[PDB]
């Protein structure tokens, strides 16, 4: 997940040199930060959406 | 063995994977109370006004 600031239009992503053997491909979408609870923890204090 | 067979990553997406797995093996249009198996949808006539 990469952040897209409000009104931002360009989204550059970089992946440091690594191994690609067996790579299958890419798949992608776009989500709203408000609708994406934070999963890097047991509880998201800033998640006010259901 | 006391060794944990379960090894997870924050990087993995189990819930979604299961969503996609279901669609591939059956008719997501059918409901199944046991697992609360009732897919989220919307009225086509609401999303697209005709």
């Amino acid at each position: 997940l990469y952040p897209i600031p409000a009104n931002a239009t360009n989204v550059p992503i970089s992946i440091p040199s690594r191994n690609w053997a067996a790579f299958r491909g890419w798949a992608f979408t776009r989500l709203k930060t408000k609708e994406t609870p934070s999963l890097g923890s047991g509880y998201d204090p800033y998640y006010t959406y259901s | 063995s006391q060794l944990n067979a379960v090894v997870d990553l924050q990087d993995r997406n189990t819930e979604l994977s299961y969503q996609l797995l279901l669609d591939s093996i059956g008719d997501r249009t059918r409901y199944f109370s046991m697992w609360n198996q009732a897919v989220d949808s919307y009225d086509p006539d609401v999303r697209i006004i005709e």
């Binding site: 440091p16 040199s17 890097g40 | 924050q10």
Partner: protein, 440 residues
């Protein structure tokens, strides 16, 4: 034979160093967040590329053909308060008088009850800690005592620190000087009939320097009734005696300025109803008194050297009998170490020459509210105050067995005697140096 491989980097041999550290800028951001320096995650990776987490995938592999072990030295640093809630040094139960009443025509009805007073975290130094306690006894009287009868004259329970018995004359039966010699010897607790204190759930006991001679019998209750033999003797009526020069002497000062009664047992006896621990200990029956089941000990502000246990669940093998689990409060232990707190000692001959001046220095007699009553007075400050002081501890555990596959993210955890993270840790970090031990 004894390699040490990593992703794709030259293999290393014989030994090296993996570092467990909280500080790292990257991981703090992501990983720990809702954690603290006593239960955190950290990447052992140390390779600038690779997103932490993605780091988590990688692993440091100690050659498989041999059983490895690693020396584990750590640097622990706290800053825990002398008196705080978590360590159980901010509370303490005591029984005081609640109401003094005129009842059913002629009866004097005294109602006593137990109550738990608390202290305001921090406030180091032993003497002052005493004061804060005495003050809490008062603060309570202020909210219940007076407004229910009970005078100051009959305030039950007060921690003092002197030998009410230095003046004492074996014939007179009185403290000739007319004053309880104002020097500090050891903390003790004084009680009035019917009341007393309980430390069952408090380490402050250890601060006063009074312990049970049989520790493991959970239940530290010291009643008035227990302080047998050894009630603070009474004061000579210095004024009467002198002016009178038979000789008055037998006259045991019954009150004081602002007229407070020294609760004397009877119009005759030279003894007062005030019982002192310190007295019972060395002045009472050694075979049945209190000296029988309690011990007079050196104070110690830390309240009791407690130990903390380390655990690196994801990096060391689980020691002999511990079983591996995921319950933070049961992780295997790999190293024990005393919790970083010492008793620095100082000299303040300024004590009691200072209490004298300290009272003017502090714009209030908040602690000395009863500057006349020889008992309720403010205990003398003892020369040689102690103060808990936090100190970094460069400890060193031994070589411990390692897993031959060290995960990218290791979990570090410092626990306490009862097994629970310790909020007062500011810095914890360790250095591990693996090395061979034998082969498979």
């Amino acid at each position: 034979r004894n390699s040490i491989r990593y992703s794709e980097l030259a293999p290393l041999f014989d030994t090296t160093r993996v570092y467990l550290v909280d500080n790292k800028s990257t991981d703090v951001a992501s990983l720990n967040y809702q954690n603290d320096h006593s239960n955190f995650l950290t990447t052992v990776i140390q390779n600038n590329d690779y997103s932490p987490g993605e780091a988590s995938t990688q692993t440091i592999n100690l050659d498989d053909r041999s059983h490895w072990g690693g020396d584990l030295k750590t640097i622990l640093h706290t800053n825990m308060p002398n008196v705080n809630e978590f360590m159980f040094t901010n509370k303490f139960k005591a029984r005081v008088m609640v109401s003094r009443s005129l009842t059913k025509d002629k009866q004097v009805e005294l109602k006593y009850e137990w109550v738990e007073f608390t202290l305001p975290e921090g406030n180091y130094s032993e003497t002052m800690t005493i004061d804060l306690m005495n003050n809490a006894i008062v603060e309570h009287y202020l909210k219940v005592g007076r407004q229910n009868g009970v005078l100051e004259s009959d305030i039950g329970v007060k921690f003092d620190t002197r030998n009410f018995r230095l003046g004492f004359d074996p014939v007179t039966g009185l403290v000739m000087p007319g004053v309880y010699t104002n020097e500090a010897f050891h903390p003790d607790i004084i009680l009035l009939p019917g009341c007393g204190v309980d430390f069952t759930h408090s380490r402050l006991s250890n601060l006063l320097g009074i312990r049970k001679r049989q520790p493991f019998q959970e239940g530290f209750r010291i009643t008035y009734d227990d302080l047998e033999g050894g009630n603070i003797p009474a004061l000579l009526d210095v004024d009467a005696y002198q002016a009178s020069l038979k000789k008055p002497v037998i006259k045991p000062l019954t009150e004081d300025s602002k007229k407070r009664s020294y609760n004397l047992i009877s119009n005759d006896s030279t003894f007062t109803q005030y019982r002192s621990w310190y007295l019972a200990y060395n002045y009472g029956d050694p075979q049945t008194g209190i000296r029988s089941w309690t011990l007079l000990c050196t104070p110690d502000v830390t309240c009791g050297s407690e130990q903390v246990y380390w655990s690196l669940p994801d990096m060391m093998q689980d020691p002999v009998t511990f079983r591996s689990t995921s319950q933070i409060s049961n992780f295997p232990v790999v190293g024990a170490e005393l919790l970083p707190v010492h008793s620095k000692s100082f000299y303040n001959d300024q004590a009691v020459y200072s209490q004298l001046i300290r009272q003017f220095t502090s714009l209030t007699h908040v602690f000395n509210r009863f500057p006349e009553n020889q008992i309720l007075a403010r205990p003398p400050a003892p020369t040689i105050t102690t103060v808990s002081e936090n100190v970094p501890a460069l400890t060193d555990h031994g070589t411990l067995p390692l897993r031959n596959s060290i995960g990218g993210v290791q979990r570090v955890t410092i626990t306490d005697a009862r097994r629970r993270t310790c909020p007062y840790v500011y810095k914890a970090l360790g250095i591990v140096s693996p090395r061979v031990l034998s082969s498979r």
